Design a protein around this nucleic acid. Structure first.
Length: 26
RNA sequence: GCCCUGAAAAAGGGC
């Protein structure tokens, strides 16, 4: 079993999926 | 329960 859920792993991914937006949008 | 897509602090979708 894993202590992280579909939200954990994806939670950090946003770190690279959000920057592009929050960064490309100024 | 696990993800994927959404930027999402929506909305969605697959199994």
């Amino acid at each position: 079993d894993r202590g992280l859920t579909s939200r954990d792993r994806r939670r950090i991914a946003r770190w690279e999926k959000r920057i592009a937006y929050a960064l490309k949008n100024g």
